[PDB]
Write a protein that binds this ligand. Sequence first.
Ligand SMILES: [Cl-]
Ligand SMILES: [Cl-]
Ligand SMILES: [Mg+2]
Ligand SMILES: [Mg+2]
Ligand SMILES: [Mg+2]
Ligand SMILES: [Mg+2]
Ligand SMILES: [Mg+2]
Ligand SMILES: [Mg+2]
Ligand SMILES: [Mg+2]
Ligand SMILES: [Mg+2]
Ligand SMILES: [Mg+2]
Ligand SMILES: [Mg+2]
Ligand SMILES: [Mg+2]
Ligand SMILES: [Mg+2]
Ligand SMILES: [Mg+2]
Ligand SMILES: [Mg+2]
Ligand SMILES: [Mg+2]
Ligand SMILES: [Mg+2]
Ligand SMILES: [Mg+2]
Ligand SMILES: [Mg+2]
Ligand SMILES: [Mg+2]
Ligand SMILES: [Mg+2]
Ligand SMILES: [Mg+2]
Ligand SMILES: [Mg+2]
Ligand SMILES: [Mg+2]
Ligand SMILES: [Mg+2]
Ligand SMILES: [Mg+2]
Ligand SMILES: [Mg+2]
Ligand SMILES: [Mg+2]
Ligand SMILES: [Mg+2]
Ligand SMILES: [Mg+2]
Ligand SMILES: [Mg+2]
Ligand code: NA
Ligand code: NA
Ligand code: NA
Ligand code: NA
Ligand code: NA
Ligand code: NA
Ligand code: NA
Ligand code: NA
Ligand code: NA
Ligand code: NA
Ligand code: NA
Ligand code: NA
Ligand code: NA
Ligand code: NA
Ligand code: NA
Ligand code: NA
Ligand code: NA
Ligand code: NA
Ligand code: NA
Ligand code: NA
Ligand code: NA
Lengths: 337, 53, 132
Amino acid sequence: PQPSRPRKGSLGFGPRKRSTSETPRFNSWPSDDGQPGVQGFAGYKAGMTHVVLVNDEPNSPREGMEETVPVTVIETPPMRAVALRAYEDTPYGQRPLTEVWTDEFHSELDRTLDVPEDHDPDAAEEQIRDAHEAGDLGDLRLITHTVPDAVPSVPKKKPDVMETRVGGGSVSDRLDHALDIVEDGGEHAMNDIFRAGEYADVAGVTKGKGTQGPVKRWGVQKRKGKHARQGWRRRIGNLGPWNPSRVRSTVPQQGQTGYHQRTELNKRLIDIGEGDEPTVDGGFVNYGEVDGPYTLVKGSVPGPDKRLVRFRPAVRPNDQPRLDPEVRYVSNESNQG
Amino acid sequence: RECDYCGTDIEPGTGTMFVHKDGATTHFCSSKCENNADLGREARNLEWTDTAR
Amino acid sequence: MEALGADVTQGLEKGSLITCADNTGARELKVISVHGYSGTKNRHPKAGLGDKITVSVTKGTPEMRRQVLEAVVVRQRKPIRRPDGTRVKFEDNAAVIVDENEDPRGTELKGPIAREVAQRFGSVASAATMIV
RNA sequence: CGAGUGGCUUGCUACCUCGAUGUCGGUUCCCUCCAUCCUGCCCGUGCAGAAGCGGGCAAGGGUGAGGUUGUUCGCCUAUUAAAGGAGGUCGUGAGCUGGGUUUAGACCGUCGUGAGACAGGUCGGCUGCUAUCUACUGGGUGUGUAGGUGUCUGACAAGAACGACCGUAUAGUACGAGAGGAACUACGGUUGGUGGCCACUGGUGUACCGGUUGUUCGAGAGAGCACGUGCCGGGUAGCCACGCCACACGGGGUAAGAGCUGAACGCAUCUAAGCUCGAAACCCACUUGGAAAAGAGACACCGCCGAGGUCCCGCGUACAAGACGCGGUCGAUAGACUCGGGGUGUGCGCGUCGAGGUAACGAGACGUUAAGCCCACGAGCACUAACAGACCAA
RNA sequence: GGUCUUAAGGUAGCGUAGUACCUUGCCGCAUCAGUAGCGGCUUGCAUGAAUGGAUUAACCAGAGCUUCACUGUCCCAACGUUGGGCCCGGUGAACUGUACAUUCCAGUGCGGAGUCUGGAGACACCCAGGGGGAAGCGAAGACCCUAUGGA
RNA sequence: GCGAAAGCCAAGGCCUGUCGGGAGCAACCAACGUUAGGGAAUUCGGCAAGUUAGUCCCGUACCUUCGGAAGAAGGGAUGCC
RNA sequence: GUGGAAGUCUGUUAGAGUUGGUGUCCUACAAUACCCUCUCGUGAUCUAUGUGUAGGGGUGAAAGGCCCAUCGAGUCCGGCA
Ligand SMILES: [Cl-]
Ligand SMILES: [Cl-]
Ligand SMILES: [Mg+2]
Ligand SMILES: [Mg+2]
Ligand SMILES: [Mg+2]
Ligand SMILES: [Mg+2]
Ligand SMILES: [Mg+2]
Ligand SMILES: [Mg+2]
Ligand SMILES: [Mg+2]
Ligand SMILES: [Mg+2]
Ligand SMILES: [Mg+2]
Ligand SMILES: [Mg+2]
Ligand SMILES: [Mg+2]
Ligand SMILES: [Mg+2]
Ligand SMILES: [Mg+2]
Ligand SMILES: [Mg+2]
Ligand SMILES: [Mg+2]
Ligand SMILES: [Mg+2]
Ligand SMILES: [Mg+2]
Ligand SMILES: [Mg+2]
Ligand SMILES: [Mg+2]
Ligand SMILES: [Mg+2]
Ligand SMILES: [Mg+2]
Ligand SMILES: [Mg+2]
Ligand SMILES: [Mg+2]
Ligand SMILES: [Mg+2]
Ligand SMILES: [Mg+2]
Ligand SMILES: [Mg+2]
Ligand SMILES: [Mg+2]
Ligand SMILES: [Mg+2]
Ligand SMILES: [Mg+2]
Ligand SMILES: [Mg+2]
Ligand code: NA
Ligand code: NA
Ligand code: NA
Ligand code: NA
Ligand code: NA
Ligand code: NA
Ligand code: NA
Ligand code: NA
Ligand code: NA
Ligand code: NA
Ligand code: NA
Ligand code: NA
Ligand code: NA
Ligand code: NA
Ligand code: NA
Ligand code: NA
Ligand code: NA
Ligand code: NA
Ligand code: NA
Ligand code: NA
Ligand code: NA
């Protein structure tokens, strides 16, 4: 008869090739509801620990009781919006119109960009406002970058740059909001965007594992029984039928596994603090000691320690926000042992 | 809580609770102790154990 | 069914032999099926704490032997996680024969029972000696 | 009784292959069809309810586990929302398996004078090849677009990224004489699938520490060998699943269907023109890839005698070559050292005790000693090594 | 039927057999479920006495079955060890090759096409892979039939 | 040690079962170790792997050609000083 | 108790054999090999050397087995183009 069975692995994350940018790029943004604001932030993965929380769920028969929750510690120091990019609507989608930059640059932004020495902020601003007058102004986003130097456990000083969208009330209002942030020095923090208890979407390039077989890469079975002793242990039965006489790309084969971008949905932000309250004893293995701006993400986060991870207010949350959850205990017990 | 074996404090959100045949209960703070116990050893006779200390 | 209020790692399969923790006259039970459970190609149907499973009597009184009854998994050796993160495991695998209404076929329950089993089978619970 | 469709069965034909297109069943892995088993939306009922029966749209998803048999089929059991059928050389042997069919050996029955036969049964009885092309999975080097850095856009491409069940409230309510017994909605959980992660549990851990047998180095101390750890006990990092986290709703258009306004046909009519609704299906939404999209893109800044890049050196958040990413004295990139954090479980020696023994001798116990030994992690720390320097470039 | 062919007309036993077509025979044991296995029945398609029958302790790399124990055979895979695999120096074959060849979907054709026809796709080269296709490579098919062939 | 057995080591012989260098050294393969809970559900079939084990004491069924079955089964002990 | 019989037992003693792995190999190390597993191991035993039997003939505990990688009638050359 041959019993049915789902295929091995999702065909929705392909091609399973190495990622073009180690820095994640969201392909979606939250809707323009509330007041004007930057729709995302970034940080660096540190490690994991657990925390005891007070059941916050109003529908849980345990609401109000202790509860142990896993948490990923992410160092989230301030970032800097160094410019405001404007897009115009055209018959061929959105396209970058212009950009408004600043003059106050972080000491080592030149490790990545050819920092501007001569720019006309006003003209750009003008061009943008004219476009808006004509009604061709497409969404507005800020070119942002991090300050790895602010994070010791992270070797790199070369900042990571990524564009984040700015959603706000009216286009005029948030446009201004954008310009204001930038003009200053673009310096902003996790607090300015997220509040503990809110759900965010965390993107990141998963841990790389190089080339792997079908079994690990797609989760196909291993040869079973006698079949396992004949000369085949981790190779599939066949690459396909006689006809079509070609190998379909839908058949699980070997390749690059790991180091792929993934936007993990609805991650609850258990807490945003600063200091060394979350650090473990002995130090986060292969990472270091945390002591500064941090975020505690419920559960796991794609990527290995030290990798850049991005935050975005959840685009498709299932639950309502339950702000500032009570944290009764944060484990500092050594991750070694 | 305190480990019913070695006697050190069991880190919250950690450990296993073994329920005996009779119904008795034994909280272990680690596999190390569970295993030393399954070997039939008594925490008092092990010098590294806080009990013994 | 109602939330067990605990995460379980089924420690049993179709064909597993477990203990009958009651005085029904059945000593040994063989798991045959797991209520409301559908598996996947090649996977052996799995059962654990708090599952109502169909069973057959392997050992016991002649009149109880070979009879196909219904039952509730009361203990398993494999660990289970409680809300506070601690794990809990028992000394053996045991079940208690039950009827259509889920009332224990027997009069007395031998050995301890996991608290979680209460939030599902009351009459089984209100018949327990020790509830861990 | 009559008219058909399909090409799964069987038969017929003898067109194709006898300088061979490897058999049946099974397995593993991939795509599909609809004549739909379940799931969504509906119509009728001999539709009170509940449970059904029959029919319409509909292929998104699911359709599982076992006992006899080589079996397909089927018979049987317990679960289940349901445990649907069929195509791909009766998909799949340059993938497996080899129980069966169909070699040589042998037995039994039948037939035969006999050699020996059987559209009978039975025991045993082999699975070759280093991939040239093509195909696809992944990885690079070049050229085209025509200097560089950073950030984007989005033609198009993939997805099931989600499918399903149980429980609670609704409610012992509507309905019903009663027995019995719903729903909308809101909740909690399970299962199957998916992607990721290791604080926790668990596995490994021929790093490490300890115990111990045989033997060799005279004893001791400390060691080698006993298969790539002698065996046993414990086990850090890492890697993992048996562990943990995350995976909608809602719009838009439709089918079957329910209707509105409405004529041909003064009436009537859901349809002819027009309109309102309405499926797990379609489109969007969401996730992944995507300037080689030849209309070969956009923006900002830097630079054309210098911007930037390659080689080099110290290393990995990367890795089969290649690629990738980071650091390079304006430095914590790697090592040493010292702390922290961890694994073992109390070192050598010496002192006391020790069944005894004239004595020699003495297994072992306690103390010194959370000792001794050890660490793939963290910190501090420029002590050592990231020096010297080459090249390409409008 | 209550003898006829052709001499006799199956006795003791054993029997759904390694012999039983019907067949998964019927009943029972055993299992949740047993075309298996064992026991009983048995009209035996087509058992049977040195073509030896029955039965049988011991023996057996002989065939079938059940139980305890055991376990990575399985649920469902993971980690590790050694030798390869990958890169480098040296050594250095063979198989195979009408030609052309970046193909895919359909169609057509001696009815099983990379090459025909229509479309679609397609920048070149290279590395690694697992083997879908070249009705892949290997062997003038053992099967079948034919030859006024052979043994 | 029962041993012309294993394992270890002399004497004697050998580093010529004769190509090397490098990557924590990926996929895949050959040999193999360990795997929680379950325990034959795998499969034609328990194939492969595993379990058991030396020695002494106790004890040992059906059946039988009286030889045997039998090391039946099952239970206990085992070092060092 | 003595005695120490056996086509007797255990046994990688030496030696002989070849059951399963349908493992490794399958342009091999090899035109029949490698490893693990397994059988015999005082006898109808294994083995060296010498010697006899020759092709429609030997030899055969019988498989049409074997008679120099050649066997339902060896090999060589000839009949033979
Ligand atoms: Cl297989
Ligand atoms: Cl089942
Ligand atoms: Mg094989
Ligand atoms: Mg740890
Ligand atoms: Mg711990
Ligand atoms: Mg199966
Ligand atoms: Mg072929
Ligand atoms: Mg239809
Ligand atoms: Mg489909
Ligand atoms: Mg076929
Ligand atoms: Mg098929
Ligand atoms: Mg083949
Ligand atoms: Mg093939
Ligand atoms: Mg091959
Ligand atoms: Mg066969
Ligand atoms: Mg057979
Ligand atoms: Mg056969
Ligand atoms: Mg050109
Ligand atoms: Mg060694
Ligand atoms: Mg019978
Ligand atoms: Mg021929
Ligand atoms: Mg013939
Ligand atoms: Mg003739
Ligand atoms: Mg196991
Ligand atoms: Mg079976
Ligand atoms: Mg099966
Ligand atoms: Mg065996
Ligand atoms: Mg003998
Ligand atoms: Mg012997
Ligand atoms: Mg001779
Ligand atoms: Mg013959
Ligand atoms: Mg010769
Ligand atoms: Na093998
Ligand atoms: Na092989
Ligand atoms: Na084929
Ligand atoms: Na041919
Ligand atoms: Na087949
Ligand atoms: Na469907
Ligand atoms: Na079956
Ligand atoms: Na074929
Ligand atoms: Na084959
Ligand atoms: Na086959
Ligand atoms: Na709709
Ligand atoms: Na371009
Ligand atoms: Na006769
Ligand atoms: Na014999
Ligand atoms: Na194994
Ligand atoms: Na191929
Ligand atoms: Na040499
Ligand atoms: Na005598
Ligand atoms: Na052999
Ligand atoms: Na002759
Ligand atoms: Na001649």
